[PDB]
Amino acid sequence: PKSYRNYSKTARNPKRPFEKERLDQELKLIGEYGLKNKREIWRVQYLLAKIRSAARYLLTLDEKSSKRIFQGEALLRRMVRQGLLGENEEKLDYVLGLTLPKLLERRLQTKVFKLGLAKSVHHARVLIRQRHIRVGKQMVDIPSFLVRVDSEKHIDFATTSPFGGARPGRVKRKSLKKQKEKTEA
Amino acid sequence: RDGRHKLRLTGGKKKIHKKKRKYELGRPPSNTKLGSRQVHVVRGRGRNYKYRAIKLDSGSFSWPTFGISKNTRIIDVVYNASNNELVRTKTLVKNCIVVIDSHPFTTWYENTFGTTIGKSKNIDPLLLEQFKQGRVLACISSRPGQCGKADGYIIEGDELLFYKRKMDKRN
Amino acid sequence: GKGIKKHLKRVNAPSHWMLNKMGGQYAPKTSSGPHKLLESIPLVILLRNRLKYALTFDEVKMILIQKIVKVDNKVRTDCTFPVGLMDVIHITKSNEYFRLLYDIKGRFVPHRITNEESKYKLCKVKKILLRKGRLSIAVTHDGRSIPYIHPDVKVNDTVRLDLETGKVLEHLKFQVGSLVMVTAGHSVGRVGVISSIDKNMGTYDIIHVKDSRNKVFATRLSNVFVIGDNTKPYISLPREKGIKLDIIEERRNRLKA
RNA sequence: AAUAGAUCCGUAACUUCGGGAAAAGGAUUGGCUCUGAGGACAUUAAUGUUAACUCAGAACUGAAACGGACAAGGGGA
RNA sequence: AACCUGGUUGAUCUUGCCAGUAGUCAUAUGCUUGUCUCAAAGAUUAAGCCAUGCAAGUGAAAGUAUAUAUAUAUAUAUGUAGAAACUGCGAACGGCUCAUUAAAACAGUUAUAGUCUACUUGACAUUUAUAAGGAUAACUACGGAAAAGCUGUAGCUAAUACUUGCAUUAUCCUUUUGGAUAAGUAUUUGUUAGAAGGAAUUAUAACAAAGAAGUAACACGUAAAGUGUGUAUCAAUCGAGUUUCUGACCUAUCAGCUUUUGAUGUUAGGGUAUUGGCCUAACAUGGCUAUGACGGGUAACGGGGAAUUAGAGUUCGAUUCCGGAGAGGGAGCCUGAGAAAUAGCUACCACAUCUAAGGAAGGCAGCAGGCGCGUAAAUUACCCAAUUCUAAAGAAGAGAGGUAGUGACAAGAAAUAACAAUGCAAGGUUUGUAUUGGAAUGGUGGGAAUUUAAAACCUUCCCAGAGUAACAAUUGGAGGGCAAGUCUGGUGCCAGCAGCCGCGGUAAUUCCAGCUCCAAUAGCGUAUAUUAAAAUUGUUGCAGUUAAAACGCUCGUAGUUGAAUUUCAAAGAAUCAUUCUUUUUAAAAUCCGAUUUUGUUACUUUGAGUAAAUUAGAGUGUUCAAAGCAAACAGUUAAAGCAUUGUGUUUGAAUACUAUAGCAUGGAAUAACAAAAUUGAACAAGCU
RNA sequence: CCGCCCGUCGCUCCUACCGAUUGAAAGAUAUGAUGAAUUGUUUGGACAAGAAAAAUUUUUUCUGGAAAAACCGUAAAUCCUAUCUUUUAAAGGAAGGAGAAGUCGUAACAAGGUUUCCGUAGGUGAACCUGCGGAAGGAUCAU
RNA sequence: UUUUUUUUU
Q: Compositional bias (Basic residues) at which positions (chain B) (predicted)?
């Protein structure tokens, strides 16, 4: 009877919501990352806190422990795939110390801005919402997409976008200019 | 019918739920008596017919000393290990005491060994006296309620002595 | 009434069946047959989710109606028929033989088998019984009652069974060199030669089994399957070869490609 | 008028703790066939002489009715 | 994220609670709502009542076919079918709900050597025959009443419905071969012997007595002999009933309960499928209890599971699955392997239908829907297409189930814009800031593809389709906790506001309005409950001189807690300077200089049985995510691999958890228990 | 200190307790009585089938058997008594608490003008007073 | 020796 499709939550309420230092730091973060509301900047800390708690649990295990190196190599493989830090940062202590901006930077709405395309982070966000981006052989328009290490090398404009070789310009404007030109001719 | 509606060993009463199920059953008893050999059948659970005897006259009776058995007919019941009202109302159980005709066993004895396998057992004077009288005491062992037939064995020895001592300091 | 349940919920299905959670709420309950429901699987999932031959119950049934599926060279038409732990199944017109073996993780997987090895099937006996005339008949794990067994055969010894004549060929004991297969243990899927036993006083007898990588693991006596002597496995093992490759060092093997 | 003798059971409020109390309220008691149990006198563990009315259960039976007459509390708030 | 803040005062430090704060898969409600995916939904209270419609039926080689239709060479033989009915199976599954329920159910752990077991599989069997007998439907003809899923006589026929009944095998002897000997399967009784388990009165064998039910008087047709249906016994399968041990909320203003009326056990017997006071007759007075019995309450079905969690913990669990219960309340029963069944019946209680007034028929806590209750809960829709069940098993069914409708229960993604120049501001020709003016995308209409049992939704492509992108986002505050106003007008202890402290008599920063800002956002308030906060329930981890709290004092049972003491150390290889690894050092039985066991329990280390869902987590780009358990690989059309022309390959659904209790297991330390002298030993010799 | 404050008595409102009423109601247990339905057994006893005779009928015998009745047994349901649990009526009584201010008195806080307080007992319109034996939380850490 | 009292913010 009841649906078996499991569902969960992503954003956790920060609690004591009227602390000025935290509110201003969140304002700094959302301004520097060109976001739209506080739900994303409440979800992201849950994202980088889940694996931080995993690292906490992993650390207390002693060395040469079968579970310890198992989960450590798994989490480090995910770390290197998601590209949070470079090869030099390899240890569990190294991957424990992560901050909000480094986790944020792997979002598409700023990856496309870093690559160029748009002259603003908000311009990039509205473009990707208007689905003018191509991740490579795959169609993506969600700004919260987490680009891995290997997905960066083939980011380009959307093939079906007007700037990607599709329809050049406004249909109404083109028809109007062509009809006025033929009427004059 | 069984296994509930009874207070625990501590003395507290288990209040009743889980109303009675069919597999418990608990069929009413039967009182097999002397008379015409007619019985009924009762369909047990899982299609297991039971031969329910309510009136028995003849069955099998075994001489245990000789390890033999002959078909004969019971005359009467004289004692039961249960309440005396049963032996008064002429019922048969699997530990009742009944009287068996001595003629078939005497004829078998005369045919085999003679005189009035593992033979030459010297019998006993008390059973010889009972044989000359013509009726002997024997105890039914089979369950008439279940198998529907009254099978028994000839009781001899110190147990026979105890039975007669309790039957007849005595009236 | 409280009679026998004629349904099986999808979530209640055994783990090795591997049923999708969203594909309804009912699992095909295996009919009564030669093996238990837990340690056997039905032809439905065997040919739909494992062989991928069919995609629906109706098409599974219309494959089944034809006498092209044979177990022990016997045509079967029971849709939910318990195949069992170890058996020989055959498809005729395409001429393939599948022997149902284990997997190191502990699932059920058919294994390609030639006609010669298919003719050679093994059954672990459960108990022997004496009948009228002082004759002994032994019952295998396949619900198969084979009479007139060798006197040297013991209760835990396994017996070579021929498919056509239904006769015993040779017995294999429980010796220290007896290669066995854990059937329902926590260490299911690993083949081993056994290292020792411990005869406990009227409880579940345990045996410590030695692996090829010198791994010793204890499992009950009630759930072992003698598959040959120390010479070689009499049964063609699957690709994993019965060696429980460890979980930590499985990922290094998985990652190179 | 209603039971009322007797045995078995059971007995409230209240109380001055003594009572209330035969509280209230019940079953039985007919019959015969029965059965059993409970003192004084003698013998080198037991066997003989000789005096009770109190209980209990199986019967069936009698016109399903019985302290068979006489004799005898009506209770409760 | 192992967290605090306002309030007792003229001011201070405490205790202390109140209030604030955040979460809830936890309910209801107010305001608002452009999108998509996902989907709880009459449990709370009334396990109350139900109109209505449906929810269990079933025939593809194979039971019975002159209702009947059709085709082959010609009334001859085959056929294909087939309404009704007889027969067989199922209907005891499933679905709903949680009233009852307190060592009961449930959960883990055992046994059934104390039992039953449909279908299926595997073995297999004993005391007129060129094929036996009746007994009946549908149907024919007359009806009854208002009717039932109502019904009589006459006649008939079949079957796999019912009932009778037709070889032969084994053993002993001279010793391939001839004689003689005997014929009961289950089940019961009496007397014996006796491949396994752990223990048999086990399997089994021998004798003496009984002894059912069968071993086919039935139907279709596969090798270039077969099948269906039915049958005796055994084993497993699908299960079930009993059953060992361990575990439960509050309450002593529940201290003694049970025992004629079985309570505790013995014997004997009935009954059951089997054990058993389950019951009966006799016998004995026993059984439980401050370690909380017996009672009482629960707005208590139990479980894995949920929330909150640094760890401890606290609260919830009707509800996706397991186990138990019920079908208005009890009780009884047939059938059937399986029911004390209830969309089966019987009787009472309480409701309630038709009625010609005689009599019939009923249980929506099944699916929709209505009434009653209530803060509160959907459509009297479509489909067996997906999963699965039933059957006489492909084509037929299934209010199971799926799909769709309502649905700000919740949950996930994500619109309400972005861009270049002047004007201004800041700054050495860089950022923001009212104008122009164009690109780009959705929302929307339609058309199509795909999709679906059909339809709808999503996605894909093409046309109209944004400048105040009029294609417009609100909720609650702006004294403190706690951000935003002594900004402006109206009212003036009245109105009101205010979770707490407090504001309101004219300058109201707290009311009523506007502008602005503030917090969140298609979401935000309100009420109740619960969790953390709470180290204000404190085992970790509280307090008791004065805030709450040492009994007036002492004795003392249960409980709790209890001095020390019995086997040391030395020697050797390996990382950095240390650390780490290995052997023995008394006595007693074992092996002809050496071969090796020497308390119990608690405790402690390892294992096997550890259902799934859920939990953390693997791997896996549903546009990410909520997901789910996939998918990936070269392939405008061929190469490899292998097969002696073709055949795709690799894979994933692992891991830890599943009490604390049970099983096995190493154990030196710490705890207990015993042996330890009013005597008890061991050795040697002789005696029985 | 022109501080604070206490009680009796006043008025309004709210909450709970007692309450005669053989209180009632509802249920749930135990006792006794009645007892529908019904298992099994027994007695039956419409015929439906057999066996004999005469050449359409009859006597007798054997099963199976429908109505109906009796007996234990399961036991619905109703009533008596007792007990337990849960609500409510109830004339009235006696309290407590909250209200913005009311009257009388001066009780405590200073040696509060009589130091305060405890237990107990008695008296008083009230706070209060008094006796006995205690404490300093005293106004005394002190010949 | 006697000395009672002092609305409401």
A: 11-22
Q: Which of B64, B61, B93 shows the shortest CA–CA distance to B77?
A: B93
CATH architecture of structural domain C1-116 = Roll (3.10)
Token code pair at residue B64: 């245990």
Angle among Cα C66, C71, C76 to the nearest 5 degrees reads 40
Note whether A4 contacts C251, CB cutoff 8 Å: no
Q: Out of A4, A5, A66, whose CB is closest to C248?
A: A66
Pick the CATH number of C174-244 from 1.20.120.1760, 2.30.30.30, 3.40.50.300, 3.40.50.2300: 2.30.30.30
Asked if A70 and C11 come within 8 Å (Cβ–Cβ), the reply is no
Interface chains of chain A (3 or more CB pairs under 8 Å):
C
Show residues of chain A in contact with C21, CB under 8 Å.
4
Distance from C-alpha of C252 to C-alpha of B104, rounded to nearest angstrom: 91
Chains A and B touching, counted as 3 or more CB pairs less than 8 Å apart: no
Q: Which nucleotide is closest to B36, CA to C1'?
A: F42
Compute, in degrees rounded to 10, the torsion defined by CA atoms B21, B24, B29, B32: 130
**Structure obtained using:** cryo-EM
Give yes or no for a contact between A81 and A51, defined as CB atoms under 8 angstroms apart. Answer: no
**Which residues of C are part of a known binding site?**
58
What CATH class is the domain C121-171?
mainly beta
Rounded CA-CA distance B92/B149 in Å is 10
C-beta atoms of C22 and A4 within 8 A:
yes
Q: At what angle do helices A40-60 and A20-33 cross, to 10 degrees?
A: 110
Which contiguous run of DSSP H or E holds residue A36?
none
Contact C219, C206 (CB under 8 A): yes
Distance CA B128, CA B124 (A): 6
Q: What is the resolution of this structure in A?
A: 2.8
DSSP chain C: --------BSTTS-GGG---TTS-SB--PPPSSSS-STT---HHHIIIIIS---SSHHHHHHHHTSTTEEETTEE---TT----SS-EEEETTTTEEEEEEE-SSS-EEEEEE-HHHHTEEEEEEEEEEEETTTEEEEEETTS-EEES--TT--SS-EEEEETTT--EEEEE---TT-EEEESSSTTTT-EE---EEE--SSS--EEEEE-TTS-EEEEEGGGEEEEE-SS--SS---TTTT----STTHHHHHH--
Q: How far apart, in Å, are the Cα atoms of A158 and each of A17, A133, A162, B56?
A: 40, 4, 8, 102
